[PDB]
């Protein structure tokens, strides 16, 4: 039984990794997800310049999930080209380099950076279009003409196999639109699903409070709350993007739920608010939980059940 | 002390009601729910024509909450319109009818209809505006042109103060160019958020299967899955909507969470996948809970507490 993957022209340990945002800001952040038993681990997504982010409290967990507005608080690209360029052991695990440009220019001008990089020494990169563009203006993903022009600027300028962060969408017309968007784009070779979903609101009974100070309590869930909606998301786009791998993220807390999303169609599986509470110790439960169910069922590899979700009649 | 209220020229013993859906579809439903401590009822949503609706497995629910692709069985609109006109006793409490036309023509043509009934009787609209659609079309309330179309042709229509019922938003633009469109709509008195949060999907480890049958197991949640996303959009559109009433719907297990809704800005609070599982002894529970965290904190009004949730600086 194992649960070793190869793709990409890589090779996995283990289908586990960190989601965008966890674990993974500062250097000390990377070599702690790089020591521990993940099979990749992603970087913080990036901004051209340094980011202090939004004023704290701008996390916060509870038993179902997170809620967070950290409003992109990063190192800068140049520190996580560094990391890839210099820093980095390969030979542990693959490394993904995230992206978060606030405008189409600030994300071509650090791909193009990131491309020879990317050429020599393997890491990939994950392009996160659950993202702000102009105020007023739905997130780059809600906005299909913006998608699009992201997608023909970055292919233009990186010319390298890539893949895109999304955020999750609810109406049927939507998962057509977005993966008929993706699908014009063949260097588009991973999907990762999900984003938080946008703009939740948490409320402490005893204080009558908001429990994050941005945008007046509002930010985006993560968690127990998410997993249905990742598996959607996971699905609809394994069943419309056959030619592209989807990554799942949103609400692992467990092999089991790492399964359902493998069932789902995921390749890789990232870990959010379950590794932000639980620390990076998860990995090697995860793992053993996976195989756990896998032994139970007979599957000795993921290949085998990827994909495989049974619908009724 | 007492849970009294007056709105939209009714007086209600209690906040409480059921959400569209649940325990309202036939007369036995309805007489169910009116000889339930609640203090309102509203019909399930309505075709002119009768349907069946999907296949069956349609509904399942869990320890976190609800999935459904009912698909809109109903008795249809001649036999919800009797009820309102003959058969309901409006000295119990009041009643909202649902209506969700597969078409804007389908709505006119039944809330021509409703008109002289709500005059008389006063019974209460609340349109449906998260009903479904085809493909290469996103639901109505996800299209603001549609949705613009729609209410501006009900309102000719019906000529009387209404209700909408929405789906929940995820980006705050959205929520800025909805509650514009509903405030471009002086008969629109109230706003119901949410309708179920759409096509998620919930899969069984055990059985490697999706749940319901329709839509390749795809529906709408309900249930502690959607909680922090109610609130959310009860507050953006209490916020955006001064003019309006809002009704919470999503989430409510109990009176802590009725509590959070109100807070929030509700003034009806809507029951949906609770009610489902706990039969219509909660509204008992719920009536109960509420007024003891009211005590406790020395509310001896909603009023007192509605809307009032605090932000940080
Ligand atoms: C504290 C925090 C920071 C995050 N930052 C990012 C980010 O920089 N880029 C990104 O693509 N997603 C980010 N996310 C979203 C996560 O990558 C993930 O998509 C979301 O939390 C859902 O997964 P979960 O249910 O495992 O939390 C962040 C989430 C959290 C909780
Ligand atoms: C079985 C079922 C049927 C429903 N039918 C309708 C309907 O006919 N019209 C409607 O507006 N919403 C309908 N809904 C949505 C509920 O009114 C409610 O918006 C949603 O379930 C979220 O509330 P909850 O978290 O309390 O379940 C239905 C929900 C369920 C679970
Ligand atoms: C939509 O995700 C974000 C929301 C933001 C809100 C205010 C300011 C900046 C923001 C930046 C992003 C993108 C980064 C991000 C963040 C974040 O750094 O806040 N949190 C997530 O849950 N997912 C993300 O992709
Ligand atoms: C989300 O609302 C619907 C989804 C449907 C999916 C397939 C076919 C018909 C559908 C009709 C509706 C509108 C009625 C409704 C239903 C329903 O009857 O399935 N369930 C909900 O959670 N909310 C509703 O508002």
Chains 1, 2 share one sequence.
Request: glycine share 8%.
């Amino acid at each position: 039984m194992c649960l070793k993957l190869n793709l990409l022209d890589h090779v996995f340990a283990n289908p586990f990794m960190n989601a965008a945002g966890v674990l993974c800001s500062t250097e000390e952040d990377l070599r702690c997800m790089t020591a521990s038993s993940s099979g990749a681990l992603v970087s913080k997504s990036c901004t051209s310049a340094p980011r202090d982010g939004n004023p704290e409290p701008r996390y916060m967990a509870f038993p179902l999930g997170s809620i967070n507005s950290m409003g992109l608080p990063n190192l800068g690209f140049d520190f996580y080209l560094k990391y890839a360029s210099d820093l980095h052991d390969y030979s542990k695990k693959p490394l993904f380099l995230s992206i978060s440009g606030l405008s189409v220019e600030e994300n071509v001008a650090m791909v193009r950076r990131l491309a020879p990089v990317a050429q020599e020494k393997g890491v990939l990169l994950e392009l996160n279009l659950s993202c702000p563009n102009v105020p007023g203006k739905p997130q780059v993903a809600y906005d299909f003409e913006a998608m699009r022009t992201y997608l023909q600027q970055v292919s233009l300028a990186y010319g390298l196999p890539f893949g895109v962060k999304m955020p999750p969408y609810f109406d049927i017309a939507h998962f057509d639109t977005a993966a008929a968007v993706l699908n014009e784009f063949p260097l588009v070779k991973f999907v990762t699903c999900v984003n938080s979903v946008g703009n939740g609101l948490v409320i402490d009974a005893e204080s009558e409070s908001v429990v994050i100070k941005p945008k007046q309590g509002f930010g985006g869930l993560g968690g127990k709350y998410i997993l249905p909606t990742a598996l959607a998301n996971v699905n609809a786009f394994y069943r419309r993007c056959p030619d592209k791998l989807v990554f799942g993220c949103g609400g692992v807390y467990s092999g089991e739920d790492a399964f359902l999303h493998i069932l789902a169609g995921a390749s890789m599986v990232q870990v959010g608010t379950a590794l932000q509470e639980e620390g990076p110790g998860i990995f090697t439960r995860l793992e053993d939980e996976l195989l756990e169910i896998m032994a139970r069922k007979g599957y000795r590899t993921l290949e085998e059940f990827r994909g495989r979700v049974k619908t009724i009649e």
